[PDB]
Design a protein around this nucleic acid. Structure first.
Ligand SMILES: [Mg+2]
Ligand SMILES: [Mg+2]
Ligand SMILES: [Mg+2]
Ligand SMILES: [Mg+2]
Ligand SMILES: [Mg+2]
Ligand SMILES: [Mg+2]
Ligand SMILES: [Mg+2]
Ligand SMILES: [Mg+2]
Ligand SMILES: [Mg+2]
Ligand SMILES: [Mg+2]
Ligand SMILES: [Mg+2]
Ligand SMILES: [Mg+2]
Ligand SMILES: [Mg+2]
Ligand SMILES: [Mg+2]
Ligand SMILES: [Mg+2]
Ligand SMILES: [Mg+2]
Ligand SMILES: [Mg+2]
Ligand SMILES: [Mg+2]
Ligand SMILES: [Mg+2]
Ligand SMILES: [Mg+2]
Ligand SMILES: [Mg+2]
Ligand SMILES: [Mg+2]
Ligand SMILES: [Mg+2]
Ligand SMILES: [Mg+2]
Ligand SMILES: [Mg+2]
Ligand SMILES: [Mg+2]
Ligand SMILES: [Mg+2]
Ligand SMILES: [Mg+2]
Ligand SMILES: [Mg+2]
Ligand SMILES: [Mg+2]
Ligand SMILES: [Mg+2]
Ligand SMILES: [Mg+2]
Ligand SMILES: [Mg+2]
Ligand SMILES: [Mg+2]
Ligand SMILES: [Mg+2]
Ligand SMILES: [Mg+2]
Ligand SMILES: [Mg+2]
Ligand SMILES: [Mg+2]
Ligand SMILES: [Mg+2]
Ligand SMILES: [Mg+2]
Ligand SMILES: [Mg+2]
Ligand SMILES: [Mg+2]
Ligand SMILES: [Mg+2]
Ligand SMILES: [Mg+2]
Ligand SMILES: [Mg+2]
Ligand SMILES: [Mg+2]
Ligand SMILES: [Mg+2]
Ligand SMILES: [Mg+2]
Ligand SMILES: [Mg+2]
Lengths: 111, 66, 141, 77, 45, 181
RNA sequence: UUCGGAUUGGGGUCUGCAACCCGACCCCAUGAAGCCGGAAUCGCUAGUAAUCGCGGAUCAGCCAUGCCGCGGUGAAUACG
RNA sequence: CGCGGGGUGGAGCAGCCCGGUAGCUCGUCGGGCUCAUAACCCGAAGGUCGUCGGUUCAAAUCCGGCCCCCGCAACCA
RNA sequence: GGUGGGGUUCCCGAGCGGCCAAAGGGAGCAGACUGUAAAUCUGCCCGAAGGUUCGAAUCCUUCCCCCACCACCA
RNA sequence: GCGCUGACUGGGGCCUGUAGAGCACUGAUAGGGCUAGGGGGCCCACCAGCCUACCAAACCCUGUCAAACUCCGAAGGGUCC
RNA sequence: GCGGUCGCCUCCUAAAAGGUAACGGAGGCGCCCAAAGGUCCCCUCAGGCGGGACGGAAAUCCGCCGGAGAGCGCAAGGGUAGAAGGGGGCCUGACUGCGAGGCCUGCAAGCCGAGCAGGGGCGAAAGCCGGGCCUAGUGAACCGGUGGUCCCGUGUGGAAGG
RNA sequence: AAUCCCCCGUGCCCAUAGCGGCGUGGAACCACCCGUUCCCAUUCCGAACACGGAAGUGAAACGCGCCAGCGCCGAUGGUACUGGGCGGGCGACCGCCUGGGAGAGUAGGUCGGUGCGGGGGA
């Protein structure tokens, strides 16, 4: 089996984003944690990071998520950053990712 | 499982030439069965009833003395 | 008469006879060979006039390898010429043969026996030839 | 007679601006049949797969291997 | 089958293409008029 | 419904005898049952969907799941069959419901097959899953014989995490599959 | 189909020197074609036709459903 | 060479347009009537569609080639 | 494009405001007669939607096709 | 009228699929081996069934061919600075 | 003369930009789709081998291997699974008013097109949407039909006719 | 802070990073995993997608290493061809000068490299 549905759908949803050419807010949700970077492509460079790992929190991951959401706005908005594009990667926009997103408002907007 | 248009699958009671199969777990509880094997009728714990092996044998025997 | 079964296009352009080259050329199958000195279109009916010259000399004996093949369609206009209307009418087939190529190439026969056969075989051909033996130079592969 | 005899018009396809040419927004850059030059930075691609400068700029070519060939317009014309 | 789409009144609109017997029905679909904005647009003649 | 005698019988009888025999180093490495997929090729019913829907009603009754419908991949003319017509039914089942179904299959169904000197042991497909076809559908307990319009069989596919054949055999052996030896 | 008993499996009885080819019969299993027969065609005018059984001859036994006889019950219809 | 038409059970012909299940007459075979044959009557069998590629899900059928066939043409010179 | 006729049980075909399984013909089936084949004879079996009345195969609107005709074509 | 922009030349980028060559694709194709299918010669007529000094799939060794083949690909040519 | 041909698309000829001829080699078009269209969300082929009742070279099912040889309505080419392919849901942007700037080009045509405005669709959003993977599916003007609208209406209002 | 090593993201080069075989990793990260109440789900199936988890395992997956059987990359020399200049042959075609110079093949090479950000080590 070459190149699984995971890595297709991943590319498929990424490639579209990378076109509009905004800052990318990438989201990696694992079985335990949820992490988010804000990346500038063509400089190939991460700007602002946030995670349930580095903020050492737990208790009900959809609620954890919204928190690393408000956490990213805060840090990021501080550098001038506004207007990004919301990655969502392999994930359906739903649940934990929907929540990091819909807690990633107050800065870093339109989602 | 999708909700609606789906069979119930409730704990049941199956009978046979033997006693009850307690396990069951199927729609339509309390079902009757022709012959269950694994209680050892039917070739399991083989009884081999009304066996023969007499095809060569019969003309080897009664024809022996006669 | 050699001829490809199942062609992809009947009627292909003539193209040139340039540049003696491109494989064949080293005697891979046998003890002796006929090598092309000049370029030509060599005709199926020419190849079989060579084949038979040789099997006749082996009295059906020996081994004969050929190694050129007539895949190039040869057209002609009926007699009745007049230029136009179309192209028309494949007669034979040819193999294109440039210099240094081995055609034919016998084996399993005495030297002076094969060398006599190849010489005969050569007269049936339109170009000049060379008879050859086999070599260190024909390597191993 | 011959049952042959046709051909269609030349479609005058190919590349219309080469690397480091100064283009303008809207200039078309490549005329092409399939997707054989994919649009890069600041390069649109029309329904006939045709690539055009999005901005005034200069043109650069990029060969990305299995990713294909890419035409970008590099802004600040 | 050449196709011509009326709407309600003032009758100016836009026209179309149907090469089929489907839909054989009243053949009606939503569109933008030049005066009012985006009404029902049925098919006539 | 998490009890299911055969399920238990796998853990407290079969898993152990398995490690004892092949000597598995890891907990996971010992063969698990995933996925009994049941399938009916029904193309006997082509232009009549009425015949199909009665047969899917049938499976659900024995499986406890409403089956899928499979549709003609390509048009193949020699026997009817244009593309996209309903061919037959297919239901995947796992995880409990595979268990509860396999349980019935071993104690009730197979005993009720005419003759049945046991299951052919060459159907292991060599990467270690097993497949079997059935002639009629009333060998299941849920079928009353007065509900049958016509007898249609099926294909049962059983998938093992056993990398090999000989292993996959053992698993099913020890589960009580009556092989013809 | 409790119609019909063809085929076939197995098991036996008897005659006979002997039943493989080729016997008759009994029992168990098996139960086929066949739902009244195209063009056509046969018999019969009364105790006849239909239907039912029984006997002889030949013969060890029998392929007899044949033949030659026996009685049992017993129609229809002849304008011409 | 040119152009148009064709090639299908034993014979002679449909079917090809318009893709999906090859028909008609005669002939042949088995029976009936007759002393017998023929006529007549009741049944039956028989063709892969010149050939090779191709198109399609499917080709006697649509396309291409080759092969025989019939017709027309070959004038100014 | 226009005008006039249509549309009925398998085919044709008449078809009326008081119901018209709906004349009739032939086809098919089963009987009678039979050298063959028939001829003769007896039985068997409302284009569409809507609408007007108590009743619609009948009257109207509409829609779909057929036949017919006339006319036009930048 | 403009007036250094011209042909040609130097350097630099980009573009291309020819000459050559190649056989990875599409086809063609010689010799061998190994092998489905098969002609069959036939062992039976029940699945069987051994041999190929004929066809011939695939597959492997060896060896080639192509305007409408290309895993490759010059010299040159075009265009902008 | 007879025969063939005559516009459009694809490939080769065509000499590695473009263009390029012959009664040079080969094929196709004169349509089609209310989903075969927009969008969002998923999904990934053909083929080979093993397995599996009726199932056979191939109906459907399961395993593994298979980077694209499948599919993309139709000819070929280019393209293409990191989708243009397959499925589903909501939908009609197969909108109106325009159109920087260019491809092409003797003319006239043919072509691509960002962007703004109106009112929308799908989407959480970024966004996409002015038919369809693309390249054929076509016809200047004149004369007339039909629908609409404001415009003109031969002294004036109408009307005729534009 | 830095340098290093390990992991998780996420880019770039676009096979010298690939297939295969072996080995190795669970503290932490990651996965599988525990469940299906809830959000949300599968033309049937929590397989997938989704949520709540944290008992177990690194078996699968992945990460890291090693091996050149395959795959991939590949000189140097030498030819083919050729821009420009000249000859030769009835021809098909050949040769010389000057500049450029493949393809295959031979030697070899390779079981990746690297950026930004995290988490962890020192
Ligand atoms: Mg040579
Ligand atoms: Mg000579
Ligand atoms: Mg062209
Ligand atoms: Mg397995
Ligand atoms: Mg006998
Ligand atoms: Mg009866
Ligand atoms: Mg009789
Ligand atoms: Mg009398
Ligand atoms: Mg009687
Ligand atoms: Mg008697
Ligand atoms: Mg006769
Ligand atoms: Mg006679
Ligand atoms: Mg065919
Ligand atoms: Mg004259
Ligand atoms: Mg008669
Ligand atoms: Mg100057
Ligand atoms: Mg200049
Ligand atoms: Mg220069
Ligand atoms: Mg060449
Ligand atoms: Mg090749
Ligand atoms: Mg070439
Ligand atoms: Mg190279
Ligand atoms: Mg240059
Ligand atoms: Mg003429
Ligand atoms: Mg060119
Ligand atoms: Mg050129
Ligand atoms: Mg044509
Ligand atoms: Mg497959
Ligand atoms: Mg298979
Ligand atoms: Mg393709
Ligand atoms: Mg859709
Ligand atoms: Mg313009
Ligand atoms: Mg808008
Ligand atoms: Mg005029
Ligand atoms: Mg006008
Ligand atoms: Mg105005
Ligand atoms: Mg006025
Ligand atoms: Mg006046
Ligand atoms: Mg006036
Ligand atoms: Mg752990
Ligand atoms: Mg541990
Ligand atoms: Mg629930
Ligand atoms: Mg589902
Ligand atoms: Mg592991
Ligand atoms: Mg090399
Ligand atoms: Mg060199
Ligand atoms: Mg030179
Ligand atoms: Mg090299
Ligand atoms: Mg990295």
């Amino acid at each position: 089996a070459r190149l699984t549905a995971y890595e297709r759908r991943k590319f498929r949803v990424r490639n579209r984003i990378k076109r509009t050419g905004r800052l990318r807010l990438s989201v990696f949700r694992s079985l335990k944690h949820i992490y988010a970077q804000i990346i500038d492509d063509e400089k190939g460079v991460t700007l602002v990071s946030a995670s349930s790992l580095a903020l050492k929190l737990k208790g009900n991951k959809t609620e954890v998520a919204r928190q690393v959401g408000r956490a990213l706005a805060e840090k990021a908005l501080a550098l001038g950053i506004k207007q990004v594009a919301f990655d969502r990667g392999p994930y359906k926009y739903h649940g934990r990712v929907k929540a990091l997103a819909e807690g990633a408002r107050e800065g870093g907007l339109e989602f | 499982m999708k909700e609606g248009i789906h069979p119930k699958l409730v704990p049941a009671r199956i009978i046979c030439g033997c006693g009850n199969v307690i396990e069951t777990y199927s729609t339509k509880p309390e079902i009757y069965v022709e012959v269950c094997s694994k209680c050892h009728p039917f070739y399991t714990g083989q009884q081999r009833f009304v066996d023969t092996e007499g095809r060569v044998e019969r003309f080897q025997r009664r024809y022996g003395d006669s | 008469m050699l001829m490809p079964r199942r062609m992809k296009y009947r009627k292909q352009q003539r193209g040139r006879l340039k540049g003696a080259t491109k494989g064949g050329d080293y005697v891979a199958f046998g003890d002796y060979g006929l090598v092309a000195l000049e370029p030509a279109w060599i005709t199926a009916q020419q190849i079989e006039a060579a084949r038979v010259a040789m099997v006749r000399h082996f009295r059906r004996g020996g081994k004969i390898f050929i190694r050129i093949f007539p895949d190039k369609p040869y057209t002609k206009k009926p007699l009745e010429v007049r230029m136009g209307k179309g192209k028309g009418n494949v007669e034979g087939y040819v193999a294109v043969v440039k210099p240094g190529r081995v055609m034919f190439e016998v084996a399993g026969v005495t030297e002076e026996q094969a060398m006599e056969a190849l010489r005969i075989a050569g007269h049936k051909l339109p170009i000049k030839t060379k008879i050859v033996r086999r070599d260190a130079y024909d390597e191993a592969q | 007679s011959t049952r042959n005899g046709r051909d269609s018009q030349a479609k005058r396809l190919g590349v219309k601006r080469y690397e480091g040419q100064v283009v303008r927004a809207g200039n078309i850059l490549v005329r092409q049949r399939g997707t054989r030059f994919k649009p890069g930075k600041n390069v649109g691609m029309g329904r006939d797969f045709t690539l055009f400068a999005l901005v005034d700029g200069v043109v650069e070519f990029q060969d990305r291997g299995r990713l294909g060939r890419y035409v970008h317009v590099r802004p600040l014309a | 089958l050449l196709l011509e789409c009326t709407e309600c009144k003032r009758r100016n609109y836009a026209t179309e293409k149907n090469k089929r017997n489907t839909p054989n029905k009243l053949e009606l679909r939503k569109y933008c008029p030049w005066c009012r904005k985006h009404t029902v647009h049925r098919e006539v003649k | 419904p998490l009890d299911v005698a055969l399920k238990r019988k796998y853990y407290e009888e079969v898993r152990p005898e398995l490690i004892r025999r092949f000597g598995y180093q890891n907990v996971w490495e010992v063969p698990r049952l995933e996925k009994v997929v049941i399938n009916q090729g029904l193309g006997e019913a082509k232009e009549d969907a009425r015949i199909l829907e009665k047969a899917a009603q049938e499976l659900a009754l024995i499986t406890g799941q409403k089956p899928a419908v499979t549709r003609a991949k390509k048009s193949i003319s020699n026997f009817k069959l244009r593309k996209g017509m309903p061919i037959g039914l297919r239901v995947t089942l796992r995880r409990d419901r595979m268990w509860i179904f396999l349980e019935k299959l071993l104690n009730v169904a197979l005993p009720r097959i005419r003759d049945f000197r046991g299951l052919n042991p060459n159907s292991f497909d060599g990467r270690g899953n097993y497949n079997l076809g059935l002639r009629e559908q009333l060998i299941f307990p849920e079928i009353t014989y007065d509900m049958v319009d016509a007898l249609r069989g099926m294909d049962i596919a059983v998938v093992t995490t056993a990398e090999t054949d000989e292993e996959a055999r053992a698993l099913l052996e020890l589960l009580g599959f009556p092989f013809r030896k």
